[PDB]
CSV table of C-alpha atoms and ligand atoms in Angstrom, one decimal:
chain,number,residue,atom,x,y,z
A,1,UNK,CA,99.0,91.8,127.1
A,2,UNK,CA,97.2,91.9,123.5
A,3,UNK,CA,93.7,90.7,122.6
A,4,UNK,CA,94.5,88.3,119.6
A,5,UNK,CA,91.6,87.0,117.2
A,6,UNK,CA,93.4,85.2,114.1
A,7,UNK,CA,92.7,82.8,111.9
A,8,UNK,CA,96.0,80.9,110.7
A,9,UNK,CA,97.2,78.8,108.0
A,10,UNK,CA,99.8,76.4,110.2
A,11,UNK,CA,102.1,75.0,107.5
A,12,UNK,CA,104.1,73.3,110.1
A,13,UNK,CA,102.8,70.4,112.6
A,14,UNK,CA,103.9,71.6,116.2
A,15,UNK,CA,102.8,68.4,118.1
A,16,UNK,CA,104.4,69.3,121.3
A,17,UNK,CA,101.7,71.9,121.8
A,18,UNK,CA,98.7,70.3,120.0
A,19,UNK,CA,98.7,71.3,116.2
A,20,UNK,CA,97.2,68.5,114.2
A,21,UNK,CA,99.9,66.2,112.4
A,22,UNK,CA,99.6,68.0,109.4
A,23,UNK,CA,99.6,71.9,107.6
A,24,UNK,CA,95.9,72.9,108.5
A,25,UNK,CA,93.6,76.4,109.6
A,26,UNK,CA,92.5,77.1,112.5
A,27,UNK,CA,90.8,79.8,114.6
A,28,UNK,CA,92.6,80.9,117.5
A,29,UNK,CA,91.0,82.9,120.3
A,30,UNK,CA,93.9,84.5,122.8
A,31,UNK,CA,95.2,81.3,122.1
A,32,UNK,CA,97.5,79.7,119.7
A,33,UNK,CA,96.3,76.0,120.7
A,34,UNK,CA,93.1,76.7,117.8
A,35,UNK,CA,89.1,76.2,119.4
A,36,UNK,CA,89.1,74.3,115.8
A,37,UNK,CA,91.1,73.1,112.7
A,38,UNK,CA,90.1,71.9,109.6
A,39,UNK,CA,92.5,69.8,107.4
A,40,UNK,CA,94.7,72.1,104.4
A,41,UNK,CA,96.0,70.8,101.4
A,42,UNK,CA,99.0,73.7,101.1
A,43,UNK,CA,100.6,73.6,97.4
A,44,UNK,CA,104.4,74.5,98.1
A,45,UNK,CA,104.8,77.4,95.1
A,46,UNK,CA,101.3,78.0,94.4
A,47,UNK,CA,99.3,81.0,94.5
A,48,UNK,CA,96.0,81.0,97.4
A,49,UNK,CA,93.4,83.1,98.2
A,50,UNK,CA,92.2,82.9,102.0
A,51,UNK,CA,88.5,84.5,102.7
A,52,UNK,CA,87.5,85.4,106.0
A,53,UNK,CA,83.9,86.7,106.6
A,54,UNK,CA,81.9,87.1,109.9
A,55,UNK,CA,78.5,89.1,111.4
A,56,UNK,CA,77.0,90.0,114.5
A,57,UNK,CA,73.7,88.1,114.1
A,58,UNK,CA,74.9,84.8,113.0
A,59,UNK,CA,78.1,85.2,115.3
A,60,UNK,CA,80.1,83.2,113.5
A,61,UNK,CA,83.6,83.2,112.3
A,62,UNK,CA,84.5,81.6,109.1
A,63,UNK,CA,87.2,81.2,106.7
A,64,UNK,CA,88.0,79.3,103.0
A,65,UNK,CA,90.9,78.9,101.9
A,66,UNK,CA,91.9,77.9,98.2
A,67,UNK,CA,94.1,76.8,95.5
A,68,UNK,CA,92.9,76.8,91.9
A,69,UNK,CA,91.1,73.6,90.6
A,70,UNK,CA,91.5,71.9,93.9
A,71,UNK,CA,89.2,71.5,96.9
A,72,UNK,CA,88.8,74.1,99.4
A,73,UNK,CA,89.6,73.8,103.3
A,74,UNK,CA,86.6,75.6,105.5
A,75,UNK,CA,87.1,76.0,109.1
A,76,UNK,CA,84.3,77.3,111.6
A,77,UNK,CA,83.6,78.7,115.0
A,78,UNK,CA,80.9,80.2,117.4
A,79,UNK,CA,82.0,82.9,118.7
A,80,UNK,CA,80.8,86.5,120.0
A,81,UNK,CA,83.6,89.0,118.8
A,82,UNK,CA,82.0,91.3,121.8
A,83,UNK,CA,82.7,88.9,124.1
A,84,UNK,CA,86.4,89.1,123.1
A,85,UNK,CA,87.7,92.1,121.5
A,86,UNK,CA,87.3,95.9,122.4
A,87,UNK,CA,85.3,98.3,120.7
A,88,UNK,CA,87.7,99.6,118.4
A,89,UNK,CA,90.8,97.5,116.8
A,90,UNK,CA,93.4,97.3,114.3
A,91,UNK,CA,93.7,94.1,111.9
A,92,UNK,CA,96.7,92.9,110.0
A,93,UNK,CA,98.3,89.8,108.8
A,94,UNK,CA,101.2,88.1,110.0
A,95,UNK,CA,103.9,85.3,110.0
A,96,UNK,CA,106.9,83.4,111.0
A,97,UNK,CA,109.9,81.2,110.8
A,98,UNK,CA,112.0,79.2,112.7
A,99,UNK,CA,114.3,76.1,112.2
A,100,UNK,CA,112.6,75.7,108.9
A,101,UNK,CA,110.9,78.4,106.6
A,102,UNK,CA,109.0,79.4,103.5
A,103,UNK,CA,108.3,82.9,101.6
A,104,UNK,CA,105.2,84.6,103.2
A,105,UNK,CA,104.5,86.8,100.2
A,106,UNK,CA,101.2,88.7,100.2
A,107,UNK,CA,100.2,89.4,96.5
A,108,UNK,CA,97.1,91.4,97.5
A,109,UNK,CA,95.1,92.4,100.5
A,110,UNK,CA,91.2,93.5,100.9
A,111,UNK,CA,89.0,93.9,103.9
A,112,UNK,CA,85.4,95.7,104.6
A,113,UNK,CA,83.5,96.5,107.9
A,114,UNK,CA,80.3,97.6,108.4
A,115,UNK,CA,78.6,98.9,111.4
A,116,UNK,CA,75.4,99.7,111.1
A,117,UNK,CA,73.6,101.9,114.4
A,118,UNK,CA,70.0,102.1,115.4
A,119,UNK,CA,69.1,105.0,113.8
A,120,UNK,CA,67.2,104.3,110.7
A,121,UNK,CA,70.2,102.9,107.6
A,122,UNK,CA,73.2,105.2,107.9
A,123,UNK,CA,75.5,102.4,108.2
A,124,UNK,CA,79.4,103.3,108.5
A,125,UNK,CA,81.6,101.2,106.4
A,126,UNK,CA,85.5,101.0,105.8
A,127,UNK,CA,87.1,99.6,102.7
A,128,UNK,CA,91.2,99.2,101.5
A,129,UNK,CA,92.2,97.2,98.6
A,130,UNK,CA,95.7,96.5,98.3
A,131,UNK,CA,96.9,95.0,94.8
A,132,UNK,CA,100.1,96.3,94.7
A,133,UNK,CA,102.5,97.4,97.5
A,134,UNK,CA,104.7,100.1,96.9
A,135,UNK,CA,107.8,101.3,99.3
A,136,UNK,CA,107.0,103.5,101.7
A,137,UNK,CA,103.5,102.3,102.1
A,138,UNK,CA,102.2,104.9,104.5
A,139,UNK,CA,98.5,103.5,105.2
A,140,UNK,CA,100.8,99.9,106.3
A,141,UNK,CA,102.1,99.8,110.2
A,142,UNK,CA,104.9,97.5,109.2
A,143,UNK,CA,106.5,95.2,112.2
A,144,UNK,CA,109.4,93.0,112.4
A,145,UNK,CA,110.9,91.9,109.2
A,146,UNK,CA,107.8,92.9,106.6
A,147,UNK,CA,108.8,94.9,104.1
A,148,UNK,CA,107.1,96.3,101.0
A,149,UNK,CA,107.7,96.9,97.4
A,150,UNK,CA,109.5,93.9,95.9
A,151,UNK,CA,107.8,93.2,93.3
A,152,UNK,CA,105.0,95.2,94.5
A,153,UNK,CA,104.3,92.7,97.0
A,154,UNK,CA,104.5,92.3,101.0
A,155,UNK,CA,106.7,90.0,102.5
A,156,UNK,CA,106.2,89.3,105.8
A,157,UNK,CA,108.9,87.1,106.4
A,158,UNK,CA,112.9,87.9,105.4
A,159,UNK,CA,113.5,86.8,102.2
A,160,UNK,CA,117.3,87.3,100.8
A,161,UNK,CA,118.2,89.1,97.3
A,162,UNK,CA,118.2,85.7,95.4
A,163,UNK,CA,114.7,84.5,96.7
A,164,UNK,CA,115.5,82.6,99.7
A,165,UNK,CA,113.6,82.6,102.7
A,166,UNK,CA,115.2,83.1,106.0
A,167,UNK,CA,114.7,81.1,108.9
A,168,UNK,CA,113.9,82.7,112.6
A,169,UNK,CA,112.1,85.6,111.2
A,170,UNK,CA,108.7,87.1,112.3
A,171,UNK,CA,106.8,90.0,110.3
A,172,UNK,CA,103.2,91.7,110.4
A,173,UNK,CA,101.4,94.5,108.9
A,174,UNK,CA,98.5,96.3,110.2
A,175,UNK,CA,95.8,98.7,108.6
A,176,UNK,CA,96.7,102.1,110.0
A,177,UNK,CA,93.4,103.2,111.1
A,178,UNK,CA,91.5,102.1,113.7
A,179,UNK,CA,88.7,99.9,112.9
A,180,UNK,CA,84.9,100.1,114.9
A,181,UNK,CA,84.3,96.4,115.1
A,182,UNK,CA,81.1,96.6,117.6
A,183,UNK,CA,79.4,99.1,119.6
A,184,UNK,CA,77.0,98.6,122.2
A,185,UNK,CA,74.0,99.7,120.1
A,186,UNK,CA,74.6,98.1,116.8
A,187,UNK,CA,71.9,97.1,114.9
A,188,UNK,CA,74.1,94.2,112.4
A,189,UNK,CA,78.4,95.1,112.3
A,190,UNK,CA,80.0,92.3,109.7
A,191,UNK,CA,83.2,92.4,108.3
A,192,UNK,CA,85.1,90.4,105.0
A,193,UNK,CA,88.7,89.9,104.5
A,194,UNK,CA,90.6,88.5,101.6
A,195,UNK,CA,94.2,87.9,100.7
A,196,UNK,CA,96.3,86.1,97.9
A,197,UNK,CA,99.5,84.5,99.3
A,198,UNK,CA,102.6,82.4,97.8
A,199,UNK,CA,103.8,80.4,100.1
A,200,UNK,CA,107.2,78.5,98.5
A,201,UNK,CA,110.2,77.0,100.5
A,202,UNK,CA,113.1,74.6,99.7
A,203,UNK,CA,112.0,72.2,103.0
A,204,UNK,CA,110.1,69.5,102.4
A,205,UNK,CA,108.6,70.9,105.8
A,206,UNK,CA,107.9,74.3,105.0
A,207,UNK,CA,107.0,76.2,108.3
A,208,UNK,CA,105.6,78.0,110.3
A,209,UNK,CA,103.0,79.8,108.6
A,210,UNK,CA,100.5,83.6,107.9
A,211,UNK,CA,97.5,84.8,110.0
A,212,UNK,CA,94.9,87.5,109.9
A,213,UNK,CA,94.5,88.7,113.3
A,214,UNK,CA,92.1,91.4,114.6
A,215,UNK,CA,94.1,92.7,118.0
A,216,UNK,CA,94.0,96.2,120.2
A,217,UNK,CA,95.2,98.7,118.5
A,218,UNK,CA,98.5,99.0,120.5
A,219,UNK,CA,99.4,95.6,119.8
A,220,UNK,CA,103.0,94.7,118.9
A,221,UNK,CA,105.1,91.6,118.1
A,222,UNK,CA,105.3,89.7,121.8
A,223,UNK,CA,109.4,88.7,122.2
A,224,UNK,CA,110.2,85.3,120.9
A,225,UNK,CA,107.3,84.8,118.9
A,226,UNK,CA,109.3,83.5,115.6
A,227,UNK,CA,108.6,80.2,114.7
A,228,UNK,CA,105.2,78.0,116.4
A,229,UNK,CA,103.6,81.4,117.8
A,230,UNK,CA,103.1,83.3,114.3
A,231,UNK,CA,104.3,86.3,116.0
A,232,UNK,CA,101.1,86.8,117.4
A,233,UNK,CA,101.1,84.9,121.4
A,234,UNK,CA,104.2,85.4,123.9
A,235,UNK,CA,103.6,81.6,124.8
A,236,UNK,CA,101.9,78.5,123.7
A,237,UNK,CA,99.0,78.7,126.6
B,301,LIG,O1,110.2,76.3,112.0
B,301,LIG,C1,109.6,75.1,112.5
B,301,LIG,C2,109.8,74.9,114.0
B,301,LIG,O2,111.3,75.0,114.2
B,301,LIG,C3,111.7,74.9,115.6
B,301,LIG,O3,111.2,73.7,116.3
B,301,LIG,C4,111.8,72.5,116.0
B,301,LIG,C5,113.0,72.1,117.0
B,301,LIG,O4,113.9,73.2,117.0
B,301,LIG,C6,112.4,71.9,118.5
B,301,LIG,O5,113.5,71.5,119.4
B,301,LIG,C7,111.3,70.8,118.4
B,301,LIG,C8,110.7,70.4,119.8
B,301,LIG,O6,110.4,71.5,120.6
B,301,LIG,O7,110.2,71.3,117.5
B,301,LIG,C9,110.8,71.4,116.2
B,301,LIG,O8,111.1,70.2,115.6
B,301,LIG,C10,111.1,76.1,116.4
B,301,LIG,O9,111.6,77.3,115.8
B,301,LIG,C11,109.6,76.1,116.3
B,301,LIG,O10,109.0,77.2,117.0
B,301,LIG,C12,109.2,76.1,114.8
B,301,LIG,O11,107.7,76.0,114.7
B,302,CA,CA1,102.4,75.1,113.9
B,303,MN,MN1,98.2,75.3,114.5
């Protein structure tokens, strides 16, 4: 099976298999029961910017998530990507719905890694910056329902032509290259993400919720992983 590192924004309280009893973050490891949460405000039709960063010599995986003129939510974790991932990987962002639902619209998408190797400077880096989607986004592995170009933005999630969101629908994208997340004889690897999301539903209980997820490269949406499993875990071990 896939090697999932994510960090999600849970809109939806799955109690039955140990979400908090409200919309939170959290950073899952193989796992979709989080190693820790952290409280989140969502704002249901509001704009939000998540930030993820991380580096191999504090080893430590962070994310902060915000709305504009409000307080931000900040969830951390110890944790050796080396110990976890392989070598070389693909990240991408996903999301889900079930009973109930919400738009899962990306608005933009960045991310940078650096590796840097013994051999005096000459790091390696890799940058995308993704402000506007177009269709037929070549540089996009698109799964499920995600779709680009409405709007010039990414919906992960099926949305109909008026603007509703669609229940039972799962959706990710992934960066088309390969990315070198660690080697054996790094001197300091570190990579930052960033995305701006709307997240907007007619439920009072929006659900389920988007992830950034670093996986193996071969990864692929497991079966039946709409709704509580964010389209990322075949179960909720
Ligand atoms: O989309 C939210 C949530 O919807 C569905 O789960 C609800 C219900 O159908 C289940 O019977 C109960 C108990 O297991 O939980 C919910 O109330 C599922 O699609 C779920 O995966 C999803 O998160
Ligand atoms: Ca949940
Ligand atoms: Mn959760």
């Amino acid at each position: 099976a896939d090697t999932i590192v994510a960090v999600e924004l849970d809109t939806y309280p799955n109690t039955d298999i140990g979400d908090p009893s409200y919309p939170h973050i959290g950073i899952d490891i193989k796992s979709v029961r989080s190693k820790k949460t952290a409280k989140w405000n969502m704002q249901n039709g509001k704009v939000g910017t998540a930030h993820i960063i991380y580096n191999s010599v504090d080893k430590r995986l962070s994310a902060v998530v915000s709305y504009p003129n409000a307080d931000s939510a900040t969830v951390s974790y110890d944790v050796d990507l080396d110990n976890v991932l392989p070598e070389w990987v693909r990240v991408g962002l996903s999301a889900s719905t079930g009973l109930y639902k919400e738009t899962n619209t990306i608005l933009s998408w960045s991310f940078t890694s650096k590796l840097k190797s013994n051999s005096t400077h000459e790091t390696n880096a890799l940058h995308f910056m993704f402000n506007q989607f177009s269709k037929d986004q070549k540089d996009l592995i698109l799964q499920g329902d995600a779709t680009t170009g409405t709007d010039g933005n990414l919906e992960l999630t099926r949305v109909s032509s008026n603007g509703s969101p669609q229940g039972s629908s799962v959706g990710r994208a992934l960066f088309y290259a390969p990315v070198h997340i660690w080697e054996s004889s790094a001197v300091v690897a570190s990579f930052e993400a960033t995305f701006t999301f709307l997240i907007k539903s007619p439920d009072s209980h929006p659900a389920d919720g988007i992830a950034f997820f670093i996986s193996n490269i071969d990864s692929s949406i497991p079966s039946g992983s709409t709704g509580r499993l964010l389209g990322l875990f075949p179960d909720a071990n």
